[PDB]
Write a protein that binds this ligand. Sequence first.
Ligand SMILES: [Mg+2]
Ligand SMILES: [Zn+2]
Ligand SMILES: [Zn+2]
Lengths: 303, 581, 76, 463, 61, 142
Amino acid sequence: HPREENSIVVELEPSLATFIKQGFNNLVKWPLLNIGIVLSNTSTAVNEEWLTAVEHIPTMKIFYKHIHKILTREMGFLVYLKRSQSERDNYITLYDFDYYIIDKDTNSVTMVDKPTELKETLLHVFQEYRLKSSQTIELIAFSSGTVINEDIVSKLTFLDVEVFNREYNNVKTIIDPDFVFRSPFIVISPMGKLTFFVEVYSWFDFKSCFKDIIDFLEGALIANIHNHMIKVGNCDETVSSYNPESGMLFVNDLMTMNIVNFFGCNSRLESYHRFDMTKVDVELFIKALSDACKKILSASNRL
Amino acid sequence: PLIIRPAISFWNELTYLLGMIVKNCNLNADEQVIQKAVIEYDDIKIISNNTTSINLSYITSGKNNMIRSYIVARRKDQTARSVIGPSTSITVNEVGMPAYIRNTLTEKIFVNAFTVDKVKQLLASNQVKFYFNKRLNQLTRIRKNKIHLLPGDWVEVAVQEYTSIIFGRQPSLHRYNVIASSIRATEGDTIKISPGIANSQNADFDGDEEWMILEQNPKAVIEQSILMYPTTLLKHDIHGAPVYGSIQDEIVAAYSLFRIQDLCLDEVLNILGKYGREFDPKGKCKFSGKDIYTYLIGEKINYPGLLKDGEIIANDVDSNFVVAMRHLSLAGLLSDHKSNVEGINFIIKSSYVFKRYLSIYGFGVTFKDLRPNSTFTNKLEAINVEKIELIKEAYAKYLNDVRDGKIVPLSKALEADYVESMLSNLTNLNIREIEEHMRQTLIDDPDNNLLKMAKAGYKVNPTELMYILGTYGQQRIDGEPAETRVLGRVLPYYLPDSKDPEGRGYILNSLTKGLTGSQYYFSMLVARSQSTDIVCETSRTGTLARKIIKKMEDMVVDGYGQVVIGNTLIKYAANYTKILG
Amino acid sequence: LCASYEPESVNKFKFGAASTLKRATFGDNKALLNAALHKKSEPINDNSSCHFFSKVPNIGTGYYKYFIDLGLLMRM
Amino acid sequence: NHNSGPRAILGCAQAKQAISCLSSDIRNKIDNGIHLMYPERPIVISKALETSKIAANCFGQHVTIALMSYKGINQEDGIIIKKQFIQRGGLDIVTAKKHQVEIPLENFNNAYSKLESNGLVRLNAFLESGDAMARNISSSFDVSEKYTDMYKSRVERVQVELTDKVKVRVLTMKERRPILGDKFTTRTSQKGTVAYVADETELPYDENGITPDVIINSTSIFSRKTISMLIEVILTAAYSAKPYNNKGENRPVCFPSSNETSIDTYMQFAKQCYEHSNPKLSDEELSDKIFCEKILYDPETDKPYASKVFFGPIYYLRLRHLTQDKATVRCRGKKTKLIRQANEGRKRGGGIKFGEMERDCLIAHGAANTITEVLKDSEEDYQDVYVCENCGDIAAQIKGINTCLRCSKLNLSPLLTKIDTTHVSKVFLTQMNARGVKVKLDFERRPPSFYKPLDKVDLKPSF
Amino acid sequence: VFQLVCSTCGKDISHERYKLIIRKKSLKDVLVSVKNECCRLKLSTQIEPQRNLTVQPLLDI
Amino acid sequence: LTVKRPLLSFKNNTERIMIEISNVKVTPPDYSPIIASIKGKSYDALATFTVNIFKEVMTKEGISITKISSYEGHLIKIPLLIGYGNKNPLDTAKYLVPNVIGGVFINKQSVEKVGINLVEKITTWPKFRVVKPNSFTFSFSS
RNA sequence: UGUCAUUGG
DNA sequence: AGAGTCCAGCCAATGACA
DNA sequence: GGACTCT
Ligand SMILES: [Mg+2]
Ligand SMILES: [Zn+2]
Ligand SMILES: [Zn+2]
C-alpha cells in the first residue's frame, strides 16, 4: 500500500504520558493552507469548495525534509494548481500541484521534489470534455503565517502577477488572521499508554521525520519546564499559585497539574490541594521526560 | 392639519378624501353627495361593509388601532435580537453579549462635576460616538470639531461591561421573562444566558431568540439595578419557590453527588473546584457526598423532613431539592434564613459543583440500560397477546349469548364501560410489570443510568417505560375512543360493525416492537388532534390573558397595606398578612 | 368581578369607574365618541391614561410623588 | 413507528429544511439557495428514498456522535461540536443570494469601491454592508440600493440587461461554517443549536484515538422516546464494519420509515457484520461493538469515565436557520413619517418592538420610570410644544409669539402650557379633533407645599 | 471536489479515493487498508455532486 | 380551443352567425430552461389559432356562408412545465439532464413557480345538513 | 407603503 | 325569537407583487 | 364560529 496506518505504543508514567501528549498537542503545529487564492475558476465547483479542500492537503508527505524548519516557523510553503479539462486522465490528483518551499530568511521560493505516488491520488473529477467551452481551475495556497507582500510576489514567476494581485485584493478580507494549524498525527494516552496513530508512506522513511518531531517536542518541553514558575503568596483565581500559610496549591495550569501529579498528587484544573512544594524535583521530571523520549524513539525504531 | 396626513414617499388617502369632499362643495350641489363624501372620509362602515379604506376610524379600528400599536407599544432604538446559547462562565446575574451588539449599542455618560475628566479623556482618544448638547437641544454624531461640555449634556460611547441591559424572551407571559442583568463580553453571535434562568423564561437552546434593550436614563438605571436584578426576583411572588435553579443533567449530578461515598480529600477538592478554598477537613480523611452538601449549604438550620444542623436528613436528593419552582428547594430555605443573596450564591455554587461532578464522572444513558436483551419485552409481549385474546373471547361469549338470546343486551354505554374496564385492567397489569422490572433491574444492576434519572426525578416514570417496553394503551379522542364512520367501523382493516377493541384504538404494541399501521393511525390521530387543539387554543388564551391583565392591572397595594383599585378597597390586608407573598 | 353590587365580566366596563383612555386601550371603538357626547371630564390615574400623556404610572416607585428640599442648599 | 407521533411530525417538518444538493446549476442560476458542500449519501434508508433520488441528492453528512454530558454545556438541546471537524469542511454550506436592481439608464450612465469602470460590481469581490452593486446616481445624490447583510458575500455572477431600464441581477455566495447558534438535527427530530465549539484536545476519546464530531445529551433521547435514533446509530456502525455484500457491491441497510422487522434481527445483522470484520472477538467486546458502547477517557486527566458511552456514527443534518440571518441590532436610524417612531424591517435597520406584554412585565416589576422612559419619545427629540388650555390644540409661533389661532379669531387670549408628550399622542389627538371630538387638557396648579419636621418613630417590638 | 482528509479523524484518504473512483476497485479491496469507521464511511458515502457546466461568461451584458 | 358553435341566430333560426376557431398549433420555445433563467425570458409555449366569424343562412339546397371577419394567428403564451430531465411535452428530441426532475414553471421574472393539488368543490356524494331540528337538507350537484 | 406566499421560537 | 356588530396570542424572517 | 344587544 502507498499509505499504511501504524501505531506506536509506549507505556510510561501516567502524568508523564499526559504531559507529553498535551505538549505535543500544544507545541507541534503543522500549518494549513488557509491562505488560498483562486485565480481562474471555470469548473463546476465554486471557489469555496476548492479552498476548503486545498486547505487540508497532507503536505507532510511532500515537505518532510524541512519538517523542523516548518515547525519552528522559520520556513513556509506553497501549493499552486493550474489544471484544465482533458480527453483522457480527466481529473485532478495531487501530482498536478506544484509544491514550493518558502525560506523566510530570504523569501526564497524554490520548488521541492514531487513523488510519483501522488499520481495515485484524487482531488477532483472534471465533467464531460468539450473543447467548445473552457473548464479550468487555477489557484495558489500559502501556508498559514506567511505575510503576502511585494517581496514574495516578486518571486512568483510561475503565474500572472496582475491576476494574483487583483484576486488577492478580492479575497484578502476573508482570510483568517490567526495561525491555522494541524496536528501531524493522533496522540492519545489512556491510563499512561502513550499512543501515536501515524501514517507511513512508501516513498520516505517515517523514522527520521518522527525523530525530528520528537526532538523538537523534547526541546520545547524542556524549555517550557525550565521557564515555568509557580506564584507564591495569596491567590486570585487566574493562574496556579501556592499559599504557604495554609500549605495549599491552587492548580489552574496543565503543566503544574502534570508536574505535581508526577509527585503523588491527584489534581485537576482549577482545584486546591494540600501539597508540599518541597517534593517537586524539576530535574527528576526532566530526566523522566528524556528517558520517555528515548523510549518513544526506541518504540518507533521497531515499527 | 397636514400633520395627520403627511406626504407619503416610496419608489395621501385622507387628502384625497378631503379633495372628494371639496369637489362637491358648491352652491349648486345636493346635501346628499356632500354627506356621502363626509361620511366616506370619516367612517365608510356607516354606509358600507368594506374594510381596508384608510379613513379616520382606521386609527380606532380593532387590534391594529393607534393606541394598542403605537402608544402602549413601540419600536425602540438601542435594541438588539439574537439566538441564545448557554454559558458556564455566566451566572444568573449576568448575560453574555455578542461583539456586534456591543460594537453597535451605545451607553450614555452624563457631563457633570464627577465625570468631566472621563468624558474629556474619551473625547481625546476618539472613543465617543455621539454627543448631545442639552442647552441647544441637539444630537451630533462624531465620525476635529469643537465641543464644549456643559452639565446636562452627555456623550455616548460603546457599551461597557457590568452595564444593565434589559433582555427578554417572547412571549412575555409573566414578569420573569423580562429581567435586567449585567453585560459580559462573550464570543460568537449568540446572546449567552445562564441555564439557571432558562426555566424562568420557558427557554430552550434549540433556536430560541431573545431581545435586548438599553435604557440609559439614571432613574431607569437605578430601577434596573435594584428592582429587575435577578437576585431581587429570586423567589416567586405568589408561591415563594425559587425562580432559578438546576436543569436536566445537574439533577442527576445532584443525586449521584449525594449518593457518593468514601472519597479522598483530593477527590472532594477536585469536585469542589474553586470553592474548595475554605473547605475544612475537621479530622477526617475519608469523606462522603453528604459532607460536600453540608459544606455547600453552610448554615446550621433545621427544616422538617429536609435538614437537621445543616446535614440533609432526607434519603436522597431529588429534583424537588435543586430544580426551580419546587417546594423543597434548599436555596429557598437558605434565602428564607438570611436573604436572596444567600440563595443566589447557593444556586451559583451548586451549579458549579454539579457541573464539575459531570466533568469528572460523566453521565450517559445507552441503549443497553433500556433494553439489554429480549427477555422482559418478549415476556410482556406474550402476556399482552394472551390477555387481549382472553378479553376478545369473553366479549365474544357475551355477544353470542345476546345473539342467540340467552341474556338481554346491555346499553352501549355500559358495554363500552365494561370493555373500558377490561382494557384498563390490562394497562394496569402492564404498569405493574414495568414497576417490577424496574425494581429487579435496580437490585440487579444498581448503576443503571436510566433508572438513575428515574430515581432522581427527571422525566422517567413507569408510564413512559410502559410506552417504550410494554404497551401503548387505549388512544382517546374527546375522552372516548375514535368514533365509527361508514359501515360501523373506523378503518377498512376491520369487518363492518366490528366489535374488535383493537380496531377502536387500543394499541397492543410498544415503541420497542414498533407500532403497526392501524396503531400508527390511532397514535397519529391523537398527536394531530393535540396539535390542532393547542393551535386553536393559543389565541383564545392570549385574548383572555390580555383582558384579565387590563382589568386587574390598576389594582395595587396602597400605603396602609390594603389592596385597592381606584378609590375602592378590595382587601383590608394584602396577601392576608401585609407581608410579601 | 364582584366589587360592585353585581357580578361584572372581564369583557365590559359596566359599574367600575374606568376612564376613556382605559376603555379605548382595552378595545372599545366608540369610547371617545361616547365620552364626547356625555362631556366627560376624567382624571388621569391609571396606566393606560398615564402612558398616553407620557406620565409616570402610579405603580411601584411611581406610586409616590418626589420633591426636593432646597433649604439646605440655600442655607450654604 | 418506534418514536412518538409529534416527533414524526417535527421530523417531517425538519426534513424539508435540511440543506441538500439543491441544484445542478449552482453556478448558473441567479437564485436564492443553500447548498451542501461535501455531501454524503445516507446508508440506513428505505427504497423510496433510493427511487425518488433523494438519497443521491444528499441532504446531510455522517458524523461521529457521543451521547454524554460534556461539562454541563449540553443542556436544553445544546450540542458540542469539534473545531477541527468544522475546519475540515464538516457540515459546511454555501448560501447563494440573488439581488436584482432596476436602474434608470440616465442614472446608470451618470460606497462605490467595488464598482468597475463598467458601473457594475467586480467579479469575485466580497461585498460589505454599505456597498452598492451598480451605479445609480440621480441628477449627485446617489440612490443605489445597497448590500445590507451582516456577513460578506463573494460576487459569483452578474447578468445585465440594457433596455429602457437597466436590470442588474447579481448572484453572490458565502461559505457558512458552523458557528454558535446554528441549527442541526437528526432524522429522528433530535434538533438543537451549537452551544460550544470544542477543540479536539479538550474532547473525550476512545481507545482508537477518535473524538466525536458532535456530542448530544443523552437525557433528551430517552425523555422524548426517540428509540429509532439508537437503532440508526447501531445500523450505521454495522455498515461501517461491513459496507459491502457477498458480491462486493456497496449495499445500503434497509431500515424503512415504518419498520416491521424486529430489533433482534438488526442485532443479528450487526453481529454478522462485526464477526465478518474481526473473525474472533471476546463476547464482551462483541456486545460492546453491537450496542455501540465505548469506554471514553477524560482528555485532561487521561482517565476513563464511570460507565460506557453510546458512541457511533449517524447521518446528521444541517438546518437553514443560521445565526447571522436572525441577528439584529440598532443604535439609531430612520423614523417613520407619521408617528416619528423607529422603522420596521431588518433590511431597513429597524427597531425591535417593545410590545404590550413587555410593558406588563415592566409594570409588574414596579419600575415606573423605566417603562415611562421606554414608552415616551427620546430625549434627543425634544421640542417646546405649547397647548391651549381653552380649546386644546397646539399653539403656533407666528413671528416669535406663541399664539392660538382659534382663540385669537374668537377674540380670546387664553393660557398656553408647555407639554412633553409623544408625537403619536399629538397625532391621535389631532385626528380625534378631525373626527369632531374636542379634547381639552387641564393642568395642576398645585398649592405650594412645605416640609415640616416629624417626630421619632421606632417600629421595633416591645418584649 | 473531494476532501483529501477525513473530516472526523484527519487521516489521508486520497489514495483510496483514486483506488475506488478512478481505478474502480471494490469496497473490500479499497477498505482493506482503512481501519477507522469514520474514514470507511467517508470512502463509502461521499460523492461528488452532479453538476452541469458553468455558463460563460460570468459577467454577461 | 376548437370551437364551432352558433353565436346569434335570427329570422326564425334560419339565419345564424357562427364563430369557428381552428388550426390550433402549440410550439415550444427555442431555448432550454437554464437559458430562460439566466437571460430573463419566460419558458412559455406559443399557441396560435385561426378564428373566423361568418353568417350562415340556410336556403332550400344552399348554404350562404359569407365571411364577415377572419383572423389567422404569436397569440397565446402558455406556461410550459419543465419535466423530468428538463424535458417539456413538446420537445420530442432533447438530451436528458441526469439530475433534474422538474415539475416547476418559470415566471416572467425568472421565478420558479410550483403547484400543489387541490380538492374540488363539487362533491361526488350528496351533502347532508340539519338546518333546524326535524328539518334536513340533501344537496347534490350535476 | 401595504397585501400574498413560505418559515421560525 | 332573529339580525347587527365586533372579536379572534406575541415577536419575528425571507421572497414576490401592486 | 360565537357572545351581547335591539328589535
Ligand atoms: Mg425552543
Ligand atoms: Zn385657543
Ligand atoms: Zn476518519
